[PDB]
From Swiss-Prot, chain A:
In the N-terminal section; belongs to the AAA ATPase family. This is ATP-dependent zinc metalloprotease FTSH 12, chloroplastic. It is found in: Plastid, Chloroplast thylakoid membrane. Probable ATP-dependent zinc metallopeptidase. Induction: By high light. The chain holds residues 769 to 1008 of 1008 of the full protein. Zn(2+) binds at H1, H5, D81. The gene is FTSH12. The active site is at E2. It comes from the Eukaryota.
Swiss-Prot record, chain C:
The lineage of its organism: Eukaryota, Viridiplantae, Streptophyta, Embryophyta, Tracheophyta. GO terms for molecular function: ATP binding; ATP hydrolysis activity; ATP-dependent peptidase activity; chloroplast protein-transporting ATPase activity; metalloendopeptidase activity. Belongs to the AAA ATPase family. The keyword Cell wall biogenesis/degradation does not apply. One of its GO terms (cellular component) is chloroplast. Homooligomer. Interacts with FtsHi2. It comes from Arabidopsis thaliana (Mouse-ear cress). Keywords: ATP-binding, Chloroplast, Hydrolase, Membrane, Nucleotide-binding, Plastid, Protease, Thylakoid, Transit peptide, Transmembrane, Transmembrane helix. This is Probable inactive ATP-dependent zinc metalloprotease FTSHI 4, chloroplastic. Its main location: plastid. Functions in chloroplast biogenesis and chloroplast division. Required for plastid development during embryogenesis. Might be involved in chaperone functions or play a structural role in the thylakoid FtsH complex. Disruption phenotype: Embryo defective. Impaired plastid biogenesis and thylakoid differentiation in embryo. Defects in the photosystem II protein complex formation. Ubiquitous but preferentially expressed in young leaves. GO terms for biological process: embryo development ending in seed dormancy; protein import into chloroplast stroma; proteolysis. The chain holds residues 605 to 805 of 855 of the full protein. It is found in: Plastid, Chloroplast thylakoid membrane.
Curated annotation (Swiss-Prot), chains E, G:
It is an enzyme of class 1 (oxidoreductase). Substrate binds at R81, R87, N119, R153. It comes from Arabidopsis thaliana (Mouse-ear cress). It is found in: Plastid, Chloroplast stroma. It catalyses: (S)-malate + NAD(+) = oxaloacetate + NADH + H(+). GO terms for biological process: chloroplast organization; defense response to bacterium; embryo development ending in seed dormancy; malate metabolic process; protein import into chloroplast stroma; response to cold; tricarboxylic acid cycle. This is Malate dehydrogenase, chloroplastic. The chain holds residues 82 to 398 of 403 of the full protein. Expressed in rosette leaves. Expressed in meristematic regions of roots and shoots, cotyledons, young leaves, trichomes, stamen, pollen, tapetum, gynoecium and ovules. Catalyzes a reversible NAD-dependent dehydrogenase reaction involved in central metabolism and redox homeostasis between organelle compartments. Plays a key role in the metabolism of dark chloroplasts and non-green plastids. Essential for embryo viability. Plays an essential role in heterotrophic metabolism in embryos, and autotrophic metabolism in photosynthetic tissues as well.
From Swiss-Prot, chain F:
The chain holds residues 768 to 876 of 876 of the full protein. Disruption phenotype: Embryo defective. In the N-terminal section; belongs to the AAA ATPase family. It is found in: Plastid, Chloroplast membrane. The gene is FTSHI2. Required for plastid development during embryogenesis. Might be involved in chaperone functions or play a structural role in the thylakoid FtsH complex. It comes from Arabidopsis thaliana (Mouse-ear cress). This is Probable inactive ATP-dependent zinc metalloprotease FTSHI 2, chloroplastic. It comes from the Eukaryota. Homooligomer. Interacts with FtsHi4.
Length: 232, 126, 201, 198, 317, 109, 317
């Protein structure tokens, strides 16, 4: 589990700094890694979709490596991951910048930390009145995003297994690893590098040029309703 | 292209008035003595779950009946209304005598007793 | 199971287990077995003593099975309900409620049938352990396993295995219609005509 | 280009007493135009990888548009081609609410056994949390099944976005030079707006 | 809960038209009828899981029992185009078929909506009117000419050229249903879009010759059989909505109206429970010089077509 | 949890089963109601006797009330307790398992 | 916003199926293809005011351009029944046509949904499977056999007999799509209704012989052309919804399943984004003795049909 988390953390060009990772901390039958987000993300004050996808891919990593190695008998060791992913996935759909559910009345304010702010869990946020079909779109989107990050995690963790069991053997032998050791061990291994997710879209400061559009907004209006039944 | 939010404070008053004959006083569409509300009441009765749609339809019926009565007896004095508007715009003061003169010269038609929203159940006193 | 006594009245059985730490992992089969073990007293009292002889306590045993099955469906994520983690309070949108109810009912059908099938095969061992408990009032693990391995077994008909899609097939947004899609060509809204089979136009 | 550090909804409504119904459309158009420019000027084809979810002003813009739409729909009781569906329980609910507002403004198995059969075997307050739980669940199911007024606001915002896109596309050079100016000089005023409108 | 009788539901247009009528949420019973091959169509449509019942009648002997309780009479019967054969003989055979069909309707059900499809409908609707007059049961408010194909083609071409959303586009069409007589009112097209002169010219000729384009594109295999079924189904559902009491049944039909000197004219009408309720008077004035000269050009040809129809419908036996 | 609709299951999620929860209580009242009618209709003579005694004396103890019950009572066949049910189930199980034993033995031997 | 390619859209089944596919709210591009008479079908379908565009391709030379970016491949190709023509030559012609078409889709677009409509689909789905195997592009989760017509017929007959409202009535159907192998599961019919013995007998024989009743009702005019198009359009719409991401896409198809010893079997399946996602395993447990011996009788016939299909599909060139 820890080795899969470490591998999917260090398969990315611009993930958080891996401080260390310890198995069985103080006799508890668990394991823990420490990741420190970069200072630019803190200074930004917001999160990007690429960065949250960063988070659910890395959070999938442990259970994904467990399922890859041990097989299809999946345990509940990554339950917190299965929670955290879902929470961040909900911020993917609740947000007003979603292409499918941007212009719809999602969670509304009754009337009145961390890098990722869960607007769903606000004390003044109580879910708005939905239909049956609108909620089905919500469930479909959350399932789509969870399955996309899931497929990315599986594909990455079969892409490089040698680094996985190398970090694993380090985790048995030392019972504690550090980010410098992790970086120096895959330095001469040449892993399949992931693409950068959080590279900022930027404008040239003084290059006089008409930068283009596609030519449209990407929002699609919410109109899903079946035709009326027969015998009317 | 030019609408108003002026009559809204009246229209909700109509939304207040109609339900009073349906819940409180029993002056419903069928003259039913069913009473579900009192002057000192805090809430209503059990009211059912699908029974609310029926009385809601009743309340919309009496509201629309009053609306259509007002429309029928207001669209027949269109020119009188235009006259009153322009006299009000050009004089800025009008009295009851002036309104009487306007509705007399321009042909205002008044309503006649007995006044009912629906004549299908009206009766005469003894 | 280590020790067993009948000297006390409790909401839960007075059984004692040999606790071994190390529960890092628990499979779906472990959750199913826990659900089956949860609703034992109601099944045994309904079998030997009938429905009209249930206690107020032993009938309050399938409720814990209900809580455990809802935990398995919602907060574990190896069922066909999805691969998300829902906290029972409010992140349950009205589309997933019929799916949760149908999966829960299917799980209780499977669990109750398995409880009724297991106990009727080991009836001789059941009554032998009951008689030994009635005589002594304190029984040990070794004699429990001895009676388990030595008592005769009546063969029973196999139970029907649990499947989630077979119960979710009739729990959708449209309902029962959507499995038998009639299809309709409608020209009324707008200036266009659409022939749909359950699809939203 | 420096980050700012909130209750403009109440000011516009408390200042507008007898205003027209057409200025609501203009307010909604102005409160939903930044997302149009963002979607236009951000380069196509990431898998939504470069959006700015859950930040400062987009939440206030969404709340303002939702409030404007609710105000416009609740007061509909030519300008508009059609009207809101008007759920057939809103009328009597409004009437009862007005009546109540005017009224307001006008001022565990019973462990002791029963020796007499007349007494009950259960206390009245034993199963009371389950009654409230079932009532709350049923009320939640009833309330979350009758919002027939959710598909109307979405398409209205869709047409607003389409008009904003069509208006921004032709005058794209204005915002292009203006963005170049904002990247050039850090601070920016409305006199520079009126100068750079050329 | 209405009843629709298709007269000629085993030909080219008839089978897809019956297929579309069956699957509507308004039809509950349906009589298919043709001189032959109507058993198989009813057998095929009897397996679809839609609650609209299907019964069929074969031959003139059961045509008397076909038109009981009928609210809408659909007449798509009529031979498609064949090699080596001219306009005159097709006019005679289609006219004779529609005479027999409307005479059967007048004998059985005077009170049913009559939809005439057979070509040329410009000279066929007057024939139906005359044979309804001869029995004293002519109701001019319950006899339509299906001319929705021109409107559908106009919407398609306008939305393809100006790149507009297809559902929102609807283009008024006046005149008739044969070549030059179809005049699209491109200056009254909603949503509002500004057209040029060449675009209007090319759209007008494309709308007027689209049927010719299809019948040469088929290489003599017949005429339009799927778009015709689409337009006929749209008009049938509109007429059924009119029978429901719906207060905004606005269509484009070829009916006996008095907008111009012509007795029969295709324009926007508003249909009610009893049939024709109003004719939209906002279509015939406000036109530019293009639509004016096109209208005065097509007026004489439409008059000639209507005169040919009314003269052929009054020939002695 | 004492009912037998599915198996106890005092809580559900959909509104249909929540509505059906309160249906079983009213049918249970109805069946108790008809049972009370049958019980009181079986015992009319003792009913009249005990009503007359209650009016004349305004009080009654166990002995005289039970004496009147024995004088004018109807048949009250008592359902078996749990001991008799356990005994009959045990003997049925023993006879069935020995039947299985012989059907194994004499078919095998 | 998906692309559908109909291979053989100018025959009997093809034209109504293409017309019904055009009226779907999810189709955005339609690629008609047949060896001949496909220009006229495209001309007919290019005038409907539906935003689903229509393009046609003629001949195997342009078949390579027909399958670009196609998500759903529909194969209703295959000549209808001819007088004097036996089973083996019909199977040879239809199997050769579907073999060439499956070779083409394997060469061009191997990640597209494949729907087989040609009769018998019991011996045609294995042919497509073997041809896809020969190119190394076979996906068992993206290859279906359309047997929806049996389900529709079962629902219609059961609702007609038991006087149930036809919207909710669904009857599970297992086996295949040819005569006796179609077994309706009348004991698992919703809504819950109790059946007698002779009612189940007559309903089962009627469901099994409705196809031959259709073909003898037409008096040798072909096969079912409106109900087959109905079932194919229903399955195409369900497959298009499956690509849209709906999590409750359940159908009845003849696919490669391991629920029995038979490699291919018609049963209730659940379709996802990547094709087949689940197979309803509970359909075969809970049957009475009637359905048990019906399955035992149909197993050998279906095995023979599948063996014949695989035997033809691996014949040397």
């Amino acid at each position: 589990h820890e080795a899969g988390h470490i591998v999917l953390a260090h398969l990315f060009p611009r993930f958080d700094w891996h401080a260390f990772s310890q198995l069985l901390p103080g006799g508890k039958e668990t394991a823990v890694s420490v990741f420190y987000p970069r200072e630019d993300m803190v200074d930004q004050g917001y999160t990007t979709f690429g960065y949250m996808k960063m988070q659910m891919v890395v959070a999938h990593g442990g259970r994904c490596a467990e399922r890859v190695v041990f097989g299809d008998n999946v345990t509940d060791g990554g339950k917190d991951d299965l929670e955290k992913i879902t929470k961040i996935a909900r911020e993917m759909v609740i947000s007003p910048q979603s292409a499918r559910l941007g212009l719809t009345q999602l969670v509304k304010k009754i009337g009145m930390g961390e890098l990722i702010k869960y607007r769903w869990d606000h004390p003044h946020v109580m879910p708005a009145e939905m239909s049956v079909e609108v909620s089905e779109l919500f469930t479909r989107e959350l399932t789509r995003y969870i399955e996309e990050t899931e497929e990315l995690a599986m594909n990455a963790l079969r892409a490089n297994r040698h680094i996985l069991d190398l970090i694993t053997r380090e985790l048995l032998e030392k019972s504690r690893i550090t980010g410098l050791e992790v970086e120096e061990k895959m330095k001469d291994l040449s892993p399949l590098m992931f693409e950068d997710f959080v590279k900022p879209f930027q404008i040239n400061p003084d290059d006089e040029e008409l930068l283009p559009h596609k030519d449209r907004v990407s929002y699609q209006p919410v109109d899903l309703r079946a035709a009326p039944l027969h015998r009317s | 292209g030019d609408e108003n939010f002026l009559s809204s404070s009246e229209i909700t008053k109509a939304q207040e008035i109609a339900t009073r004959m349906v819940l409180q006083y029993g002056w419903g569409p069928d003259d039913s003595p069913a009473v579900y509300y009192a002057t000192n009441a805090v809430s209503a009765l059990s009211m059912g779950n699908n029974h609310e749609y029926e009385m809601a339809g009743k309340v919309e019926k009496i509201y629309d009946l009053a609306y259509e009565k007002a429309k029928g007896m207001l669209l027949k004095n269109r020119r009188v209304l235009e006259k009153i508007t322009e006299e009000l715009l050009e004089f800025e003061i009008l009295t009851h005598k002036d309104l009487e003169r306007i509705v007399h010269e321009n042909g205002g038609i008044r309503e006649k007793e007995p006044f009912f929203l629906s004549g299908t159940n009206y009766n005469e006193a003894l | 199971i280590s020790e067993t006594d009948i000297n006390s009245i409790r909401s839960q059985p007075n059984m004692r287990y040999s606790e071994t730490s190390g529960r890092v992992f628990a499979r779906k089969s472990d959750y199913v077995n826990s659900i089956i073990r949860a609703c034992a007293p109601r099944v045994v009292e309904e079998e030997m003593f009938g429905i009209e002889n249930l206690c107020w306590i032993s009938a309050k045993s399938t409720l814990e099975a209900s809580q455990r099955a809802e935990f398995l469906i919602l907060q574990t994520g190896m069922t066909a309900f999805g691969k998300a983690y829902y906290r029972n309070q409010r992140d349950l949108v009205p589309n997933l409620v019929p799916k949760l109810e149908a999966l829960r009912d299917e799980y209780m059908r499977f669990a109750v049938e398995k409880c009724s099938s297991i106990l009727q095969e080991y009836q001789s061992a059941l009554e032998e352990i009951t008689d030994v408990l009635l005589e002594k009032g304190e029984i040990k693990a070794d004699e429990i396993w001895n009676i388990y391995n030595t008592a005769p077994r009546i063969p029973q008909k196999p139970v029907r295995p649990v499947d989630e899609y077979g119960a979710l097939i009739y729990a959708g947004r449209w309902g029962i219609h959507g499995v038998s899609l009639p299809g309709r060509v409608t020209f009324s809204p707008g200036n266009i005509g659409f022939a749909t089979f359950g699809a939203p136009r | 280009i420096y980050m700012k550090k909130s209750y403009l909804y109440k000011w516009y409504f408390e200042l507008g007493t007898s205003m027209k119904k057409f200025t609501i459309l203009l307010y909604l158009l102005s409160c939903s135009a930044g997302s149009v420019a963002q979607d236009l000027w951000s380069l196509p084809v990431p898998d939504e990888k470069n959006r700015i979810t859950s930040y400062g002003f987009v939440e206030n813009d969404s709340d303002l548009v939702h409030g404007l739409l609710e105000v416009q729909g609740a007061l509909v009781g030519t300008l508009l081609f059609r009207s809101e569906p008007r759920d057939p329980l809103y009328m009597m609910q409004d009437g009862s609410c007005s009546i109540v507002d005017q009224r307001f403004l006008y001022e565990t198995s019973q462990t002791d056994p029963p020796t007499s059969i007349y007494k009950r075997w259960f206390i009245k307050n034993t199963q009371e949390k389950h009654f409230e739980l079932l009532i709350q669940r049923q009320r939640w199911l009833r309330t979350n099944s009758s919002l027939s007024n959710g598909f109307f606001r979405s398409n209205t915002r869709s047409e607003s976005y389409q008009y904003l896109s069509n208006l921004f596309i032709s005058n794209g050079t204005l915002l292009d030079r203006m963005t170049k100016t904002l990247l050039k000089k850090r601070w920016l005023f409305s006199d520079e707006m009126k100068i750079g409108f050329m | 809960s209405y009843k629709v009788a298709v007269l000629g539901a085993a030909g080219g247009i008839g089978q897809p038209l019956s297929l579309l009528i069956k699957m509507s949420p308004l039809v509950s019973t349906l009589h298919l009828y043709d001189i032959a091959n109507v058993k198989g169509v009813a057998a095929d449509l009897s397996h679809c899981n839609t609650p609209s019942q299907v019964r069929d009648f074969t031959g003139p002997s059961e045509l008397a029992d076909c038109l009981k309780d009928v609210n809408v009479v659909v007449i798509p019967a009529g031979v498609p185009r064949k090699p080596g054969m001219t306009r005159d003989d097709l006019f005679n055979i289609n006219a004779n078929i529609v005479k027999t069909l409307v005479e059967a309707v007048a004998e059985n059900c005077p009170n049913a909506f009559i939809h005439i499809i057979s070509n040329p409908v410009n000279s066929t609707v007057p024939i139906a009117a005359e044979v309804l007059k001869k029995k004293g049961v002519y109701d001019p408010k319950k006899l339509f000419g299906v001319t929705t194909l021109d409107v559908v083609r106009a919407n398609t071409f306008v939305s393809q050229k100006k790149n507009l959303k297809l559902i929102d586009v609807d283009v008024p069409v006046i005149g008739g249903h044969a070549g030059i007589t179809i005049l699209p009112l491109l200056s009254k097209t909603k949503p509002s879009v500004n057209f040029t002169d060449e675009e209007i010219q090319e759209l007008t000729v494309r709308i007027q010759n689209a049927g010719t384009e299809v019948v040469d594109a088929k290489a003599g295999a017949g005429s339009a059989t799927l778009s015709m079924a689409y337009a006929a189904a749209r008009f049938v559902e509109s007429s059924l909505r009119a029978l429901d009491g719906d207060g905004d049944v606005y269509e484009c039909s070829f009916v006996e109206s008095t907008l111009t000197d012509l007795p029969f004219f295709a324009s926007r009408v508003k249909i009610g429970k009893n049939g024709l309720e109003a004719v939209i008077e906002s279509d015939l004035q406000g036109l530019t010089e293009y639509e004016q000269k096109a209208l005065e050009a097509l007026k004489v040809e439409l008059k000639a077509s209507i005169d040919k129809g009314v003269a052929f419908a009054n020939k002695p036996a | 949890g004492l009912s037998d609709k599915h198996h106890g299951l005092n809580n559900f999620w959909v509104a249909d089963r929540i509505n059906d929860i309160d249906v079983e209580a009213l049918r249970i009242l109805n069946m108790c109601y008809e049972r009370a009618k049958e019980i009181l209709g079986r015992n009319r003579t003792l009913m009249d006797e005990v009503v007359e005694k209650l009016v004349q004396k305004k009080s009654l103890t166990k002995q005289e009330f039970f004496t009147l019950v024995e004088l004018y009572g109807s048949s009250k066949p008592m359902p078996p307790s749990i001991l008799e049910l356990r005994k009959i189930k045990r003997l049925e199980l023993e006879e069935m398992v020995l039947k299985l034993d012989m059907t194994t033995a004499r078919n095998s031997s």
